[PDB]
Amino acid sequence: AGIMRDHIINLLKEGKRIDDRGFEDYRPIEIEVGVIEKAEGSALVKLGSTQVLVGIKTSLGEPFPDTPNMGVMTTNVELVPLASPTFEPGPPDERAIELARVIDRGIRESKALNLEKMVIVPGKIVRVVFIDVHVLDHDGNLMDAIGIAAIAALLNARVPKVRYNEETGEVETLDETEPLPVEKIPVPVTFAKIGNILVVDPSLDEELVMDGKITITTDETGHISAVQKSEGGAFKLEEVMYAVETAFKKAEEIRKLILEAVEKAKQ
Template sequence: MSSLITKVRAKQIEQLLENGKRLDERGLLDTRELKIEQGVIEKAEGSARVYLGKTEVLVGVKVETGEPFSDTPKEGVMTVNAELVPVASPRFEPGPPDENSIELARVVDRGIRESRAIDTGKLCIEEGKKVFIVFVDVYVLNHDGNLIDASAIAAMAALMNTKMPNYEVKDGELKIKQGYKPLPMRNHPITVTLGKINNKLLVDPWLEEESVMDSRITFATGEDGNICAIQKGGSGYFTPQQILEASKIALDKAVELRKKLKW
């Protein structure tokens, strides 16, 4: 992504990194302050607003019914969509999703899907005909870097906040009963992204760091400590050693975050 950052600023970031420092005075492996508010949109079945430093992401979950995919007739469906709305940054323009928002949505989707976070087997109403469809819509409200981590955490927080209608199936007809139950979950993936600037790895890059970094790498890990999704991005590269180092850092950070969030 082209940037407005001046070459001077880029140099400053690089020089600070040489001494293990960052512009916002964090250590290389420190994340920004994380704040989660759940249930902020009453009309959505689930929602969460996440602040990661100044980055702000709102996720709304809607649950509807529809047809399952033909290769998974007994399972509910989850789809993730991301919108980089123009309120979030002077660089975002209205219009259909570009490659950045599609990548964002697909990386968030992969973490949730591959860790089998949602128990989709419990979302079947009538095999092959009717299942619940969980729409996860990521709305970026303020872009200050590391949208992937903020969106992934917000998506999980929103799913954990999601209420499903109580229902029963009679002769293939869906009957909604009184009350709600939580969306069936069985894993809580945590996503950690690292940036690489001048061969230095740093956790949770913010906007100015993102605009000078060579590349980034994202790891999503499940409760058991296994990795369930990886995505390298940016026009640089990683050496095999850097990948191993990054994966270790990301796994440690995920454990730390998991403790803090009690997920």
């Protein structure tokens, strides 16, 4: 390490990355949905050797008093100690917290999970959705691994049909399952700045040497539902511009892999 910073910068100057990826290349992606069969939905995403399982468990609960009109979505990233020697047991650390929040915002702010279609009895009984992200192996670009697995798990989710029996006031969970109201497919795309070069999908080795990171989360609509510059470093306005644009293209490429994984699982 730190010996490694030098190799990586030097390689960068020659258009090269340590694994012969181009600056706009993701590592090989594997998305596999419905792998936790007892969950309502799930997704194993591999970004290279980076692995994250996301699990959708849903229950019925009260909405928040502020929003009697919306269901609940709550996103947690466990950075499990097994995943990295830098992951220690305990309450989420700030890495985990910032990853959870950025992915949530991505999904939340694109109305990707339409919470308004998750109401059963307004003000009283909503669908409560838990996105629990189990990071299995941290080898870089966990932000993208997780947002990809979160959204793919949501698309994969099949939750029990609920109906309010207007005549008893009883709420009946039924054996028939339905999709969640997933209406957009936000994908974070994340760049590491190393010197004056942004490189998509930084591996661990590049994260160790990077100056800063920026994540742009975009949906099919041409909208950005989250941006997060994370870590230190600085970006020029026009690096942001580049990143926003590149992100949009990388997103569309991933989005296809997500949809293909989601559809494969109904096979």
